[PDB]
Design a protein around this ligand. Structure first.
Ligand SMILES: [Cl-]
Ligand SMILES: [Cl-]
Ligand SMILES: [Cl-]
Ligand SMILES: [Cl-]
Ligand SMILES: [Cl-]
Ligand SMILES: [Cl-]
Lengths: 404, 404
């Protein structure tokens, strides 16, 4: 089958809105989590978030921006970065063999709330004509494919925390089917109390670290108490290898493995069994040893351990270095898969492994695995794996191999 | 390349909640559209909908149903029907080589509204722990994969009106990649004023027929005035041919063509050009003449004609018989693609072409095309085509060939 590489990236996140800032914060171990006054004012129990600090209206053409909620807007800025990074020409961006596969976990709870408040107070006409494109499940793909004049595939995948990892794997598969040469893959996620309250109510979020927000997300720590919600966007340029070499592309990495499985077990907790099969499917096409695993690792009591049990079954006594970057970044939901793919690309480009932050007391149930608690500098980091596991028992695993 | 057939179906719709009732209403030309008092009470300008008449809480065990909104519930009941219809065994349904690809355009605006009303009036805990799975973009896949113990692929696609057509085509592609043998493909969509108001506010919906609701959806009629929103669910069993033959499956049709393209131009306005490329891509793998085209045909002034311009460019003087079944069913959004695939399968089983209803005066801009205004009985239907075109310039076309 045709080989597939990544030739450009872009990111909007609480760790930074450009690759150099994000790389630096991963290397230094600086969390992007902050206190969220709006959460406290609205009666949430979790008062922490990984929030993006941007004036989106000053960064995006108004004709484009009117159709967007924050999820699309974050993804759009990430895509602009990825296009610049990749050096693709307008004709390489806009042609039947170049596509877009990008999604979100939610869409825009804020625009939905505004629409209904408006209906009740002011009537239907005052809702305005832009709410469907901001709130539909395809908001991220629709709002990007249209202004970038994408002519190839155009759809969104939604698979909760697996969303943007499935997007990248499906971009690879569209190229392997022979249907596309270039696919923009990624995701976006709005961060607002109108979405975070739903997670608070199901008992998913951190609450015990509201006074020390930078410490709240602490995968593998004995005092972890739920995930820290986040927003943002990411996009990668997925490209067929011969196309990339012929145009003199920069090549970060080859996509060498991809798994997508289902637990068929519990709506909210991983089975561990599905994750084992997902990692094995990703590894079935990989000959090189795995140097680093970026876990799903959300800072939840059950989930962090269940995934580690699966890692132990897959690798036995030969596990790779492991960290969760969610201890720094929080959980960007639909954006988590592409964010973590990007973090892994930046680690390989920079020759370092980000440590698993905020571990005061390593959970004894994971202490036999090589959980990296500090940055590994001067790392010969060639082959990396990232897991993304969402509600509904949906699993995604990507394996990337550094291009020399 | 592996061949792909459809071996089971299920449907929840305003035309019926079983395939025999639906087939009868298609043949007789009986619309499912009714007056919606809640729309009028809430100040919408459109007072018509295609609504499902089911007591969902009597049909789905509460332990399953608590995680669902209506979109997932409709899809679940369609999947129960498709499982019975297919004759698959529990070991064939729950297997690493059996997957689920099913989505929605929205998810649950009703559950979002209830959650925020509850947060404001009663606080965060009273929202309850079920709202994320009801409202997340992957609600339809998550809420089915878990109880049916799906082990293979598991994710949603969201692409507006193309959603469940892309689900079917991607199910076909997973089988062609060699990754799955059976994939449940389809979609679901909630119908509620909290979603319909968004479409009303963009000027998309019919308003001139509120006193005569069954006449409101009237694709190609000179006095069409917008689409009629609907809800429901549909699911088809997409299966590798040798697997189907070995297990003695019933076989409706082979999937012989699939297109998926992007306009890369208008967020909402119909393109003509993207539709031409999508139909050509579907037809590139088809040698048989097309006997029938089920258009997207939403009963919009511009959209109906833009699509017919594309059909004229693709087929010229050899255009197939055409009808829009949306004049009967309304527009089920995320469920439209699988609903119309099912209607086409039922037309091939019954040897009839459903008439394009409610045409008092055929629009002169489409009158040169063979738009059937009445049901054709004793129709020799071997190869049928269905278009689904969504906001964001997303396009799908499926071509199905009757299995003799
Ligand atoms: Cl396990
Ligand atoms: Cl998660
Ligand atoms: Cl939609
Ligand atoms: Cl309470
Ligand atoms: Cl006629
Ligand atoms: Cl539409």
């Amino acid at each position: 089958m045709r080989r597939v590489v990544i030739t450009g990236l872009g990111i909007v996140s609480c760790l930074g809105n450009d690759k150099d800032t994000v790389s630096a914060n991963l290397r230094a171990g600086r969390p992007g989590i902050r206190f969220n006054p709006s959460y406290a004012e609205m009666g949430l129990r979790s008062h922490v978030s990984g929030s993006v600090d941007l004036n989106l209206e000053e960064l995006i053409d108004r004709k484009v921006f009117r159709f967007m909620g924050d999820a699309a807007a974050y993804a759009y800025l990430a895509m602009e970065q990825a296009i610049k990074d990749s050096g693709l020409t307008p004709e390489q961006i806009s042609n039947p063999r170049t596509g877009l596969i990008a999604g979100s976990g939610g869409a825009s709870t804020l625009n939905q709330m505004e629409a209904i408040d408006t209906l009740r107070e002011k009537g239907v006409k005052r809702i305005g004509p832009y709410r469907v494109t901001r709130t539909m499940g395809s908001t991220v793909s629709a709002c990007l494919a249209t202004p970038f004049q994408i002519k190839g595939v155009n759809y969104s995948i939604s698979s909760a925390a697996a969303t943007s990892a499935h997007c990248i794997g499906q971009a690879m598969e569209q190229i392997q089917l022979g249907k596309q040469d270039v696919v923009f893959a990624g995701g976006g996620e709005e961060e607002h109390w109108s979405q975070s309250c739903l997670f608070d109510a199901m008992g998913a979020l951190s609450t015990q670290y509201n006074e020390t927000p930078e410490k709240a997300s602490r995968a593998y720590d004995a005092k972890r108490d739920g995930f820290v919600i986040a927003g943002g966007g990411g996009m990668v340029v997925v490209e067929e290898l011969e196309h990339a070499l012929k145009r003199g592309a920069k090549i970060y990495a080859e996509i060498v493995g991809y798994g997508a499985t289902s637990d068929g077990y519990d709506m909210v907790a991983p089975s561990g069994e599905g994750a084992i099969r997902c990692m094995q499917q990703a590894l079935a096409t990989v000959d090189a040893p795995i140097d680093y695993l970026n876990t799903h690792g959300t800072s939840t009591p059950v989930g962090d351990v269940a995934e580690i049990r699966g890692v132990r079954e897959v690798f036995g006594d030969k596990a790779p270095a492991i960290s969760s970057t969610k201890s720094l970044s929080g959980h960007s939901l639909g954006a988590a898969g592409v964010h973590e793919a990007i973090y892994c690309l930046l680690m390989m480009e920079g020759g370092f492994i980000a440590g698993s932050a905020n571990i005061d007391e390593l959970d004894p149930e994971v202490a036999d695995l090589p959980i990296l608690r500090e940055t590994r500098e001067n790392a010969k980091l060639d082959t990396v794996m990232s897991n993304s596991f969402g509600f509904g028992g949906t699993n995604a695993t990507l394996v990337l191999k550094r291009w020399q």
